[PDB]
RNA sequence: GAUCCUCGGCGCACAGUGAGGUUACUCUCGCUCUACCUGCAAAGGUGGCGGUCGCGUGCCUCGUCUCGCGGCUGUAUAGA
């Protein structure tokens, strides 16, 4: 279970097919691809879930049915959205996709009707779903939540298994590959966390390194972090890290500290950092996309012997908030939520390009 | 920003999050910027709270004048959400006030005296 | 110097807290027709073109494809 895809050399960037498709909805939040005929979904603060056909890679992604939520929905078990969706993810047997927000509700969904087939509650008053990730290849999801918990589910029994306890704070990203286990980052707490679900244990890995500190060390020949806010995993023994400073960081398991950082990865504009706002490795690959709202998609390449990532290139076409990324192949197809707001409402000051809509970038080779 | 004083690491930024959370529970706070400010001119507040992303800044520029005439002790937050939604309320606010710490007086104090010792002192 | 009281007439902007509450458009690009007629436009119908089944039907290759006919029918890849 490691990386073995190498294709990040052939990648045909430059020429990249590019595109952009409008919704009528405010504030996608997340998208989540399906891959076996090709699926997305899509969710929105307007609560609501909408489903694309993405298998035609040369023309773009093609609504095919929504399901809106509403004040009708107020109670929390019933069968319908009623606060901000924060979080999609595609089962990947094609027969479910989960959504979950500030309601406090994971809602599951048949692909077939777009019909809610089983709702269930976290049960908890400050348990809003942040992030939502299966296992790969498995009917198992977990649901990093806003009460510190992380909540574990089998999604064909539809209950809730059990519940992971660490972080002190927020889970605002969770990412899981084939094993049993999965990657947290828990915002302010500055940590990342590995669970091994059936060893019952847990590796913690921390930032939020001193800038005086780091040039202290530096000197022997610069932005705070505040928050870990993005995660994704490229293989069972290694995963990347985004930070509200631009920080892109490489961690290896058997590590405490980062193998690797690439501070400010998406610039700036006394001095302020771009957040990274959006971080998906390809899985088991040397390809790692990463996104703020910089007005780039920024490709990313990952060294054979796993201790360095250097840049690939940039999709230029992608303004606006981005909210999640996703890529499906068949030739690569980057699928990325652009919104005018950041997912959890963190407050963005001149956003260049604002819209709302689905950005889409076909790469050959 | 300009109005922000002195610089505050985000262990101590969590800390003064957490003192105002327990405050609600077990003693007296004040919130909102024209309560924050009420709070200083009559001196019952002990510890003052401001958020560093205010947008128009001059909104709690009047606040570090004040709390120095009264010599009440403030402190900076990076973020007005995170700061209104410890005070109990499900929108933001720019800044707040602790006026009797109650189950916090310990975690307080080692508040007003971090700041005490990254200001200058002893 | 006025008091103040009443009335009357004529105004009703000031005292504390704190997060509750409340998809559409615009612009570009292109985008199934066509002959005819019934027809003043418009509107209608026929034709085109296609596609469809039954069937016949041309191969020193008689596979498949060619071809047409009867029924009917109108539906391209589809969006940027």
């Known amino acids: ?280 490795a390809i899985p088991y690959s040397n390809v790692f996309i990463s996104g703020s709202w910089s007005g780039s998609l920024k490709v990313w390449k990952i060294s054979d012997n796993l201790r360095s990532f250097e840049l690939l290139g940039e999709l230029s076409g992608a303004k606006g908030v981005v909210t999640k990324i996703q890529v499906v192949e068949s030739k690569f197809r980057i699928l990325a939520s652009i919104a005018k707001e950041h997912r959890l409402g963190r407050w963005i000051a001149n956003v260049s390009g604002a819209r709302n809509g689905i950005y889409s970038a076909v790469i050959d080779q | 920003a300009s109005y922000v004083k002195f610089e505050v690491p985000q262990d101590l930024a969590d800390k003064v999050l957490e003192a105002v959370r327990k405050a609600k529970e077990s003693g007296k706070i004040k919130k909102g910027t024209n309560e924050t400010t009420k709070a200083v001119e009559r001196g019952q507040a002990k510890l003052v709270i401001i958020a560093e992303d205010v947008q128009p800044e001059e909104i709690v520029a009047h606040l570090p004048l004040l709390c120095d005439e009264k010599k009440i002790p403030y402190v900076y937050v990076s973020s007005k959400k995170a700061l209104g939604e410890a005070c109990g309320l499900q929108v933001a606010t720019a800044s707040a006030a602790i006026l009797e710490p109650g189950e916090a007086k310990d975690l307080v104090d080692e508040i007003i005296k971090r700041v005490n010792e990254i200001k200058g002192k002893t």
């Open chain 1, 1 to 280: 279970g490691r990386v073995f895809r190498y294709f990040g050399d052939k990648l045909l960037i430059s020429e990249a097919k590019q595109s952009f498709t409008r919704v009528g909805e405010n504030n996608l939040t997340c998208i989540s691809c399906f891959q076996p005929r090709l699926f997305a979904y899509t969710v929105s603060k307007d609560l609501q879930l909408t489903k694309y056909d993405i298998t035609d890679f040369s023309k773009r992604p093609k609504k095919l049915k929504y399901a809106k939520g509403g004040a009708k929905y107020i109670p929390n078990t019933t069968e319908g959205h009623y606060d901000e969706i924060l979080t999609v993810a595609a089962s990947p047997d094609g027969k479910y996709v989960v959504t979950g927000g500030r309601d406090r509700k994971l809602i599951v969904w048949s692909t077939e009707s777009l019909s809610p087939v089983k709702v269930i509650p976290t049960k908890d008053r400050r348990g809003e779903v942040l992030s939502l990730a299966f296992r790969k290849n498995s009917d198992q999801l977990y649901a990093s939540c806003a009460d510190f918990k992380i909540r574990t589910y089998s999604i064909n029994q539809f209950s809730q298994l059990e519940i992971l306890y660490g972080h002190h704070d927020i889970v605002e990203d969770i990412s899981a590959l084939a094993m049993e286990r999965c990657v947290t980052v828990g915002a302010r707490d500055r940590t990342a966390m590995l669970w091994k679900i059936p060893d019952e244990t847990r590796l913690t890995f921390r930032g939020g390194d001193e800038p005086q500190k780091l040039l202290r060390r530096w000197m022997k020949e610069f932005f705070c972090e505040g928050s870990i806010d993005v995660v994704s995993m490229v293989d069972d023994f290694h995963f990347i890290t985004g930070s509200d400073n631009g920080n892109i960081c490489l961690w290896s398991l058997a590590k405490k500290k980062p193998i690797f950082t690439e501070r400010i990865a998406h610039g700036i504009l006394l001095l302020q950092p771009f957040w990274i706002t959006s971080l998906y």
